[PDB]
Structure formats: structure tokens, C-alpha cells
Design a protein around this ligand. Structure first.
Ligand SMILES: *[C@@H]1O[C@H](CO)[C@@H](O[C@@H]2O[C@H](CO)[C@@H](O)[C@H](O)[C@H]2NC(C)=O)[C@H](O)[C@H]1NC(C)=O
Ligand SMILES: *[C@@H]1O[C@H](CO)[C@@H](O[C@@H]2O[C@H](CO)[C@@H](O)[C@H](O)[C@H]2NC(C)=O)[C@H](O)[C@H]1NC(C)=O
Ligand SMILES: *[C@@H]1O[C@H](CO)[C@@H](O[C@@H]2O[C@H](CO)[C@@H](O)[C@H](O)[C@H]2NC(C)=O)[C@H](O)[C@H]1NC(C)=O
Ligand SMILES: NC(=O)c1ccc([N+](=O)[O-])cc1NC(=O)Cc1ccccc1
Ligand SMILES: NC(=O)c1ccc([N+](=O)[O-])cc1NC(=O)Cc1ccccc1
Ligand SMILES: NC(=O)c1ccc([N+](=O)[O-])cc1NC(=O)Cc1ccccc1
Ligand SMILES: *[C@@H]1O[C@H](CO)[C@@H](O)[C@H](O)[C@H]1NC(C)=O
Ligand SMILES: *[C@@H]1O[C@H](CO)[C@@H](O)[C@H](O)[C@H]1NC(C)=O
Ligand SMILES: *[C@@H]1O[C@H](CO)[C@@H](O)[C@H](O)[C@H]1NC(C)=O
Lengths: 367, 81, 367, 81, 367, 81
């Protein structure tokens, strides 16, 4: 059991406190350092598993050794001594540039920093596959590949006497959260007159019991059997946008299509949902065009009326009906038109606040 | 939870769902970056370059070493209380 | 004519449907593959135009062949057999790392993905100039350079028996939309008291008949004879910001200058527009300082009053007047002050919603 | 359309206009990434490394091949309807 | 003294005017070019200080010379003439690719562009340390390293006859603004029921006399004796968020924690501030758990009640009290709940504007 | 200025302050990118590659040279007024 001297240290985040305790538990013993220092001195490989019986294996990596061993040593009696030093000097400066970039002042908090194995690539000789193979990763299936690339390292010791950096890594494994479902959303444009609109919804959302949540897909991979994320992906969603996804069409915002056109049709549940005001829709089976009622905004095409439909020049056979026949626009409450560009958000917000400060003075005068 | 019927009336459909798996880290393994290469089979032909490399490294390594010592020196065994 | 089996496939975006049909039209015939497989086996170049009379030319690229041919083969009888394999093994692992990064799980939808020629650079041997030259691009003018770098590739075949990837590219050419004008906007600060403000407008806007639109300059190059974009750049602009650009000064938002100062003067139409409260303005011709009326916000300097003006230490000769003499601030309706930082937007929006929910209960009580 | 006079009163000017040209893609050309190099003039000195390379590639290539087959198997000639 | 011909040039930003004048003052004299052209022709080093007595030293860098001198020349009588040209041709194409990327059409305004020394790395041979060393930077302390990497270059001459580019650099030195204090803010979550919240504040803010400002930490390094920024970091903060930081708790917004949990404790002023509803808190000294009053939102742990506290499994000794005992939630005015995700901001703003346009028609009807 | 007491009641603390130093640029130094390497010890073995390199460079360099001349030709000595 150890205790943190909090009055002495005065201030620290939870991330720094927990990494500091972890630093005490995972750092090499003071004489394990002396053993490692002597083992490192006597090796000459680019990567080497240092086994001292009793203590755990330590993986040692030397970032320019492959170049020295493969390119410089075989030239030892064919190139001059000055040239050999000049050749190695270029490698050392480029390697120092990487050490500086990764471990230099751009590294804010060395105690709680977690460095991804891929960011260490140049420090480890320009490639990480042999490191991962020495740790047991075969490269035989994509999941093990994703896990191997999710490895993060913490710094546990910096030796200024012998110039080496000891890092501690941990192995990622998958933790399935069975109550969370990730959903990919996809929209098609619809027409009001000659204006082409679409509903603004997130590309990915998550359901979790009572909750609908936002989903950050940055750190995720959509494998065939599940979404694999190396970091937390869930984050809160405003009640209003949750209400939109729960069926309140008036809560969903909308905007006009960018450029010339939007996504104007989609295949879903074996049916074609299509903005047939914006593209030519045609029944291939009968040869007859499919007109969009001008007081409807979309067409829901299924095999009950057209087994094989042509849509913007592509011919698609469809299945039995899974979406009702389009309803009149007048039976659909559309939500507010918006822009997501940040200057538009700021300019319209400034206007709204001014209109509200005006409105806030009159209902005092009249009441 | 999601109302697919009403969303489809304004052009929004779901095109896939999946379970959610996050990565958790466990166990431990030590990795050492050996900054000083073995140059003995180069017979002092890189002596100047190696000494300059070592000097450039010191400027970077000393602040990290100091930051780590600043933390671990405030971590004592339980009964010092 | 082909048809998509939509009931079988069930769900697909328009992008996937159209790429899938394109995949059927552009993929090599089943026996064209057997021809290609045999041609690839017997070549030894880094890049090679594979011509089989009748069928089209196929450009073959081998990502480590230059290294094998230029560096390894000339060493065959001077380095050991183990060393040769070790040297090539380092190249193969680095090359596999690039294949994994580009074609691995980070590639969401291989059917509709479009890979830029520059993203293929490492897969093609670390440089694309020789590929482009074999396709006919000379590098003789900048437009052909931009078009050549706008090439995108689609995957049409992956051979797991002989380990090769067939891609289909298309050639970009320029499509001028004569009714769209791109405009670069540039602001100068102005002073209210000792507060230094500027109007918040987009850096680029587009006019298009009745419309003013936003303009995403990311994929564009501003050539001397037109703006060349490799992607759609136009996207909607809110009515309020359009009204701002149409002359409603009260619709334009404003904010305080960052840091110490803003852009405090500008040359436009041969005149100098200057915030002379914020810098020293002086007529060089007469030697007399140019004071800014404290109830004016800017000074419009032209040769009718000063042929050669000094402004923050730079001496500029100006032309005849193209902007009226500054008007009093009291004859200018300024718009709302705003911040575009996202936490400020969110915090002020939360406040506005609360004030509106308060205001919404009182006008029910009083009415 | 843009009111340059009123914008100049609040410090905004246009410093350039240009026509708008977008790139459209046409025609076609096949490009092949040959993943397996010609190594015959290396006389089996890279046999171990090549076999390992091929095995690493398979894990990546098979899912792409499968995705492409999943699509093209749902694309039939017109009269199958 | 020089004058800009503003009627001839017609339009230019202040940045272009000032760089253009600087271009006239810093460009080499017309015959200094002829001297430089002849000096460059007769050298063969990768980097070389060109000293012509009278005129200043000019630092010349040749981007493929180390490769020619170290790799190609020693092979001159062991490899064929074709192979030598092929080897160099690969380097030249890769080098041209870098020249094109940096000096090609992606460089919008060559007169006022400022290119960082690090962006020039490949143009200078793949590393900048030897360039910086020739200029006097030792690499002996981190501040000189940061300054050396803050160097920016301006283009002053492009020679199409002899193919060289002359750049002018300036040396960064530190300008301390003693009245500006940078503050790092850090939040802990708190509980209302089983809902876990936190206050939304910026990670860094700056105080400056009367002002609280936003702070962009992008270009900054937090050295032990001060924050060193290579660019202006200060930018305006909305009055409402300033009021939040000035003690108006109702002006501070709040949101729910992402993922599973937030930062649930922190060490500050030798005390532990902890959300003890969300983690196990326990006095190690007495062995007794520390319950959080359900009408309190946080616990402020100091040595007056517990000299050694255990918090989520970490044991921390704390100092004398620096934060009062927690107050009841009912004595704290909480601010609005918000989301910072941009679609949520846009969707809720659209709703707010609609509610305000409704509200704006009724108080005309009733008044 | 910042009210640490009230902020601590909603979980916000300051964990560090520092002075603010910004970089200002001064003096000058000329740097020349020599695009044409010295190839004489390669005895015309790179003649084709060098000529092609030079031709590729021209397309890039000429517009920059022209932009610089467009500016400096509008910068005259004081008495031309
Ligand atoms: C599906 O959408 C419609 C709106 O398009 C919803 O119907 C509205 O419901 C509210 C009250 O819940 C009524 O005040 C409106 O008059 C209704 N509008 C129309 C046009 O009928 C309907 O509630 C939504 N369904 C769900 C489950 O949310
Ligand atoms: C140019 O700007 C001024 C505002 O600075 C506009 O004048 C205002 O116009 C509205 C009605 O359109 C009046 O209610 C205001 O009283 C006017 N304000 C002032 C100070 O005169 C003017 O309309 C703008 N010109 C254009 C073409 O939009
Ligand atoms: C610290 O926070 C409290 C709110 O939590 C502030 O007290 C409020 O002050 C306003 C007027 O300034 C009163 O109308 C409210 O009734 C007060 N609320 C409560 C719960 O007391 C207090 O002013 C803040 N202190 C400072 C310096 O801003
Ligand atoms: N209103 C609530 O009850 C609410 C509850 C939880 C959260 N939450 O994210 O955890 C956010 C909420 N409210 C909003 O998101 C509206 C909003 C959106 C953007 C900017 C300002 C205000
Ligand atoms: N009001 C309209 O008629 C409107 C019409 C079209 C579009 N359009 O972008 O296509 C946007 C519109 N409205 C806004 O942009 C106001 C706004 C801006 C940011 C966040 C919320 C609301
Ligand atoms: N109200 C003011 O007096 C104000 C003064 C100066 C600045 N300034 O940044 O310099 C901003 C101000 N106002 C806001 O930031 C509110 C806001 C925030 C985001 C979007 C719209 C409106
Ligand atoms: C370097 O390598 C040699 C051969 O592997 C080894 O015997 C020796 O211990 C190392 N020498 C030094 C000085 O580190
Ligand atoms: C490799 O190259 C040689 C020489 O170019 C060629 O003759 C041969 O067909 C290729 N050999 C194999 C096994 O692919
Ligand atoms: C190239 O280098 C040689 C040796 O350094 C030097 O003498 C000569 O002036 C240069 N030659 C040419 C043609 O530039």
C-alpha cells in the first residue's frame, strides 16, 4: 500500500493521480534498472527480448540498429571513415528529430500521457510489425490487428546516464456493452416546390435503454459482427434531437441540399425511397413513368405496384411493401430550417438574442 | 426507441445497427527504447556524430526524468502517515 | 442492361448502388483476369503498361520493385543471402503497413470508396509522377497538374490467388458554371470609442442568380483565370447572412479583434480604407496628420484630398475617389455583437432558451 | 446582389471575384497494384520474408474481395426478372 | 523611402502591402544575385554558408546533395551509368513532389506567405538541425529549441534561370506581456440524483486587467516559467461566460458526462474535491466511509476531518482546509443544461427561433 | 477577477497559472534553396533525369517569380510622386 502526499504535491488531476500510482506499481525496481542497463550495453539487435530469469521479459528496441547492421557495417572496408560517420550522422539527426517531436515540450504531461503504438513507429525504427509479432500478435485476423494497434504506452523511466526510455504497455481486449446499439442513419432529399431539402440527423446514433445518444465514430471500426471502438464513443444528445429521433418530426431540423443535388433515392428493407420530383422514376415492368404527387414529398416504391423500377437510370428489383404509400405534405409537420455553418449559427444567434431583449421589454410595459 | 415510421416520412432511414464493443486495457509489458546504438563494428568512425547526438538527447530527456521524479517522490508507503 | 437485386440486398445507399453498377461495367472480364495474372507474373518493372491487343492498356505498378532492381540485385554477389532477405523484409513490412492503412478496416465501404491518387502514393512506390506521365500528363502547366492530382480510383477486383488489386480511375476535366461568381471578402477593423471591432463575414461567398451562398474553399485553387475545385464547393447560406451581404448592416454580426490588433487598413479600388483611430494616418503630400472624426468609424482616403498617404508607416499613392467620405456612426445601424467560439455559442444559447421559457410563461399569464 | 456600398461602411470589401470551375470525371483506365514483386534474381534469399508478407496480405485482401462479391452477385442481366 | 503605387495595384490587404514593402527592403540587390548565382554554381555541399565580404552571409541548402555525395559518387565505378541516373531520378521526382506541394498552386499568396522552418524540412534535405546549428542554435535548452522552430521564411526571389529560391527568415525572441495571466481550468463531475453533470468552462482562460479572455493553446508550450506561444493566443470571450468565471454560477452552462463517467475527484490546494456519490470515498485514518449528503453535490475533504482519505481506491494524505464544507444544492443556482455538439446547437437554435417568432406575434395581439 | 470560491461550488478549479510570452520576429537572414545539384562527379550519367527535373521545376517557379515581380514593380522611390 502506498499513499500520495497531497499536501506536498498540492494540485493534481485524477488522471495524474492514478497514473502516478500506476507509475509506482509498474516502474522497474532500482536494481532491475542496473540489470537492464548492462543487458542493453551488450546487445546489437534492432529488437531484442531481454530475458532475465525471475524478472519479466523486457522488449528492447534500437531505432537505427538495422541501418548500422545492414548498411553501414557491410561497407566498413569499402567506404572511408569520414563517410561512415557522415552517413550515420544523418540518421541520428533524423532520429533525434523524432524523439524531440514525441518526447519534447509538445508532450504536456509525461506522467499521464498515453502514447499510441503507431505514434511510436519512428522511435521504434519506422515500423511496428516486428514489435507486435514479438508480443504474440500474428496478423492473422482483423480483430487482433485492431487490438494490436490500440496499444498505448506510458513512460515509467527515463535514463539520462545510459540514454534509454522505459515504457509500460497494456493489452486491449474487447468489452461488449450488450445494451448499447449503434445505428447508422442515412437521409434522402425531398422537394417542397423546386426547393430540395433534407432532414439534419447525425450519421451515427446509439440507443441505450431509455436513452438516445450521440456517437463519435472516430475511434471505431464497423466490423461485420459489431462496432469496435478503442475509446469511449458515447456522448449526450439534447432532449430535442432525441425527440426528433423518437418521432416528433417537428423537432427535426432541415436544410437545403449543398451543391446541385442530394442523395435522391435509397434502398431500404427491399423498397426504394425516392425523391421522384428530382430524378426520373419509371416502372420497368410496365414502361410507365412514376410521377410524384406535387403535394407529396417522397415516393415509396415496392413490388405491389412496380416489381422492377428504374431510378435515375439504375434498374432495381424491389420486394413487397415495407413503407406505406406517401402521405400528403399537409399531414407532416416539418421542423425548422437551419444552417450548421458556424458563422450562420453565430449570426442568427446574435439576432435571436436581440429580438428576445426587445421582446423582453415590451411584455413588462404591457403587463 | 427510434421511430422509424415517422423518420421515413422525412426521408431518414436506418441502414444498419451493430453492438458496441470498447477496448479495455489489461496486464502489462515493459518496452525499452534503447537510444544509444551499438557502434563497435564501426571502429570510432562515428565518434563525433554519436557525441553530438547524446548531447542533443540530454536536453530532451532531463525534463522528463525530472517530471517523473517530482511525482514518485510524493508517493510513500502507507505507514509514513 | 443489368438489374440490381434489391430485395436480396435489402439496403444500400445511392452511392453504393451507383458504384456497384459501375463496378459491373468497369470490372475486367473473367478471362481478362487470367490474361492479366499471366502478364503480371512475367514482368519485373516498377511500372509497366500492359498492352494486350484488343483489350485496353492496363497500368501495372509494383511498390518495391525499384528497390529490388536498383539496390538488392546489384548487391547479389557482395552481400550474404541472409542480409539480402533481411533488407527486403524491412521494405515488405513497411509496404504492408501502407496496404493495411489504406485497404484495411479503416476503409469503410470498398464498393463506393474513391481513393485519391495522392493517397495511393506509397502503394505505388512512394511517388506518382511516373504513373501520371505514363497516362499522358506532362507537368507542363499548372492546370494539368491540378487535374492529374484530382484523379480518384475505385476498387474493381482483389485477387487473393495472385495478390493484386485492380483499380479504375477517371480523368478530371473542368466544368465551368458560368452563372456562379466566387467572391473573396476582407474586413478592416473599426473603432467605437477605444473598442476595436470588425464585421464577421465569410472569407469566400458565391453569387448565383438570386442566391448568395457559402463557399468551401478547401478543394479549390484560385488560378488566375478562375477558381478550380475538385469537389462541389457551394453550400447554403442562411437568409439573415444573405441579407447582411445584400446591404442590411444590422443583419451583419460583429466581434472584437483578437490579440492586440486587427487588419486596420486595406487598399481597394485604388483607395485606402483605414481605421485611423487605431494607427497613425498622415498625408505625405501636405505633411498633415489625418484625424478620424470620433463619431466616424473609418476613413476613406482618396487622391481628391491626399494623393500620397502614409498609413502605419507605409506610403501609398492613391487614385480618385471610389468611396464616399465617411458617414457618422449614428447613420449606420450596427448588428449584434457575437463570439464564434463554440463554448460561447453554447453557453449563450442555453441562456437564451432559459430567458425564452421565462418570457413564454408571462405572456400567457398577462394575456 | 452584394451591396458593396453598405458593406464598406462597416469595413468589408471584396478583393477579388472569379468564375467557378468544378472537376468532373470521365472515361476510364485500369490501374493494377501488383503486390508480389519479381524476386527471381535474388535466388531464394527472400523466401521466408516473401511467405510472411503474403500471409500478412491475405488478412487484408480477403474481406475486400468478399465485399465486392457480395455486391456483384446481386447484379444480374435484365431478363432474370 | 519607397511608395506603393496603389492606383496601379488597385487592391491589396495590409498583410500584402506590408510584406511587399518588406520584400523591397529584404530582397537581394540585382548584382548580389549575379554573385550568388556564381557562388552556387561552384559549390558541392548539402549546406554551405556563402560568405562574400561586404555582403551578408547567405545560407545555401541543396536538397539531394547528401544523397549524391554519400550514395551515388562512391558507387561511380561499381554501378552502371544507366543505374546511377535511375537512382538519382527517383530522388529528383520525390524532391520535385515536395517543391510542388509547398511552392505550387496550394500556396495562395507568395508575397505574404510565411513558411515555418519545419514545413521546409523536406525542401532542405529532410531535416533542419544542421541549418539551425549553422545559424547559432545549440539545442542546449528547450527555449532555444522552441524559438528555433518558430522561425518563419518569406520568399524574396525565385530564379528561373539558375533554379533557386531565396528566402528571408527572422529570429523569434520572447516578448513577455506581464499583465496577462494564463489559467488552466479543470472540472469534476457532480451528481443531481443519479444524473452525473459537469460545468462547461474552457480548458484555458486568460485574465488581463479588467478582461477575462479566451485562450488558444494551439501554438503554446507550457514551460515551467511561463507559457510560450509562437502566435497570438488571446481572443475575445462573451460577457456571459466572463460573468460565469466571475462567480455567477447561473451563467455557467453544464452538460452530462460522456461515456460512463467523468473526472470524479481532484487534488487542489492540498484538499480533495470529490463526487462521493459516484465513487467510494473513505477515511483511511478512521476506517469510516464518507457519505455524500444527497442534497449536496460535492464533498470537500481536508485534514480537519480526515488526514488520509481513500478515493476510488487511491489513498491520499491531505492538508488543512482550503474549501468550505459543501453547501446544499438549494443554495447554488445552476445554469442551463447544454450540448456543444454542432447538430444539437443548430437544431435547438432553430427551435428557439421558431418559439420566438410565435412569442413575437402574441404580445402584439395582447398589447 | 476569477471567482474561485463560487466556481469550486460547481466543481471547477484552477490547476495552474502562468505568465504569457509571445514570439516576436526580428533581424533577418537569407536562406537559398539551391534546386540544381552539383552532378559533375556523375559524368553525364543523370543528364536525362536532370533535364526532366528542370522542366518540371519551371512550371512551378515561373508563377511565383511573376507574382513577386507584379508587386515589386508597383514599389517606386519616393520622388516618382
Ligand atoms: C408522427 O408525426 C406527426 C407530425 O408530423 C405527429 O403528429 C402530431 O402530434 C402532435 C401531438 O403529439 C399534434 O399536436 C399535431 O397536430 C400532430 N400533427 C399532425 C400533422 O398530425 C405524430 O405524433 C408523430 N408520431 C409520433 C409517435 O411521434
Ligand atoms: C444600408 O444601411 C442602412 C442601415 O445602416 C439601411 O437603412 C435602414 O433601413 C431600414 C429599412 O430598410 C430603416 O428602418 C432604418 O431606419 C434605416 N437605418 C438608417 C440608419 O438609415 C439601408 O437600408 C441600407 N441600404 C440597403 C440597400 O440595404
Ligand atoms: C455566488 O453564487 C450565488 C448563486 O449560486 C450568487 O447568489 C445569487 O445572487 C443573485 C444576485 O447577485 C441573487 O439574485 C440570487 O438570489 C443569489 N442566489 C443564491 C442561491 O443566493 C452569488 O452572488 C455568487 N457570488 C458572486 C460573487 O457572484
Ligand atoms: N435542455 C435539457 O434538459 C438538456 C439536458 C441534458 C443535456 N445534455 O447534453 O446532457 C442537454 C440539454 N439541453 C440542450 O442540449 C439544449 C441546448 C443545446 C445546445 C446549446 C444550448 C442548449
Ligand atoms: N430561416 C430560413 O428560412 C432558412 C432557409 C434555408 C436555410 N438553409 O440553410 O438552407 C436556412 C434557414 N434558416 C437559418 O439558417 C437560420 C438558422 C441558422 C443556424 C441555426 C438555426 C437556424
Ligand atoms: N453581447 C455583447 O455585448 C458582446 C460583446 C463582445 C463580444 N465579443 O466577442 O467581442 C461578444 C458579445 N456577445 C456574445 O458573445 C453573445 C453571443 C455569443 C455567441 C453567439 C451570439 C452571441
Ligand atoms: C556490441 O555488440 C557486440 C557484438 O554483438 C557485443 O559483443 C558487445 O557487447 C557490444 N559492444 C559494446 C561496447 O556495447
Ligand atoms: C521475373 O523477371 C524475369 C526477368 O525480367 C522474367 O523473365 C520472369 O518471367 C519473371 N520471373 C518470374 C518467376 O516471375
Ligand atoms: C561542382 O563541384 C566541384 C567540386 O566541388 C567544383 O569544383 C565545381 O565548381 C562544381 N562544378 C560545376 C559544373 O558546377
Amino acid at each position: 500500500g502506498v499513499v500520495l502526499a497531497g499536501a506536498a504535491l498540492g494540485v493534481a488531476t485524477a488522471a495524474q493521480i492514478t497514473a502516478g500510482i500506476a507509475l509506482h506499481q509498474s516502474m522497474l525496481n532500482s536494481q532491475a534498472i542496473d540489470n537492464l542497463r548492462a543487458s542493453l550495453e551488450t546487445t546489437n539487435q534492432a529488437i531484442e527480448a531481454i530475458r532475465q530469469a525471475g524478472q519479466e521479459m523486457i522488449l528492447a528496441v534500437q531505432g537505427v540498429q538495422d541501418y548500422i547492421n545492414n548498411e553501414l557495417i557491410p561497407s566498413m572496408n569499402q567506404l572511408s571513415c569520414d563517410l561512415i560517420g557522415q552517413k550515420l550522422g544523418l540518421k541520428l539527426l533524423r532520429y533525434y528529430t523524432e524523439i524531440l517531436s514525441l518526447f519534447g515540450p509538445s508532450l504536456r504531461d509525461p506522467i499521464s500521457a498515453e502514447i499510441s503504438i503507431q505514434a511510436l513507429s519512428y522511435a521504434l525504427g519506422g515500423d511496428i510489425n516486428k514489435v507486435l509479432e514479438k508480443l504474440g500478435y500474428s496478423g492473422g485476423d482483423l480483430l487482433g490487428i485492431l487490438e494490436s494497434r490500440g496499444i498505448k504506452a506510458r513512460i515509467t523511466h527515463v535514463d539520462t546516464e545510459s540514454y534509454f526510455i522505459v515504457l509500460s504497455i497494456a493489452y486491449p481486449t474487447l468489452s461488449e456493452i450488450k445494451g448499447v446499439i449503434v445505428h447508422r442513419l442515412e437521409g434522402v432529399s425531398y422537394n417542397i416546390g423546386s426547393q430540395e431539402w433534407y432532414t439534419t440527423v447525425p450519421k451515427y446514433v446509439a440507443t441505450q435503454g431509455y436513452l438516445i445518444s450521440n456517437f463519435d465514430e472516430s475511434s471505431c471500426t464497423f466490423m461485420p459482427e459489431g462496432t469496435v471502438c478503442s475509446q469511449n464513443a458515447l456522448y449526450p444528445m439534447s432532449p430535442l434531437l432525441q425527440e426528433c429521433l423518437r418521432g416528433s418530426t417537428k423537432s427535426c431540423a432541415r436544410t437545403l441540399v449543398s451543391g446541385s443535388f442530394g442523395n435522391r433515392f435509397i434502398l431500404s428493407q427491399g423498397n426504394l425511397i425516392a425523391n421522384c420530383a428530382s430524378i426520373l422514376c419509371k416502372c420497368y415492368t410496365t414502361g410507365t413513368i412514376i410521377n410524384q404527387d406535387p403535394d407529396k414529398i417522397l415516393t415509396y416504391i415496392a413490388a405491389d405496384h412496380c416489381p422492377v423500377v428504374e431510378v435515375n437510370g439504375v434498374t432495381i428489383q424491389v420486394g413487397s411493401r415495407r413503407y406505406p404509400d406517401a402521405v400528403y405534405l399537409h399531414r407532416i409537420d416539418l421542423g425548422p430550417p437551419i444552417s450548421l455553418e458556424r458563422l450562420d449559427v453565430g449570426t442568427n444567434l446574435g439576432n435571436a438574442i436581440a429580438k428576445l431583449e426587445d421582446a423582453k421589454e415590451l411584455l413588462e410595459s404591457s403587463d | 426507441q427510434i421511430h422509424w415510421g415517422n423518420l421515413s416520412k422525412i426521408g431518414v432511414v436506418g441502414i444498419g445497427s451493430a453492438s458496441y464493443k470498447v477496448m479495455t486495457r489489461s496486464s502489462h509489458q515493459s518496452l525499452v527504447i534503447k537510444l544509444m546504438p551499438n557502434i563497435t563494428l564501426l571502429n570510432n568512425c562515428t565518434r563525433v556524430e554519436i557525441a553530438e547526438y547524446r548531447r542533443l538527447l540530454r536536453t530532451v530527456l532531463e525534463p522528463i526524468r525530472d517530471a517523473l521524479n517530482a511525482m514518485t517522490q510524493n508517493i510513500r508507503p502507507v505507514q509514513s502517515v
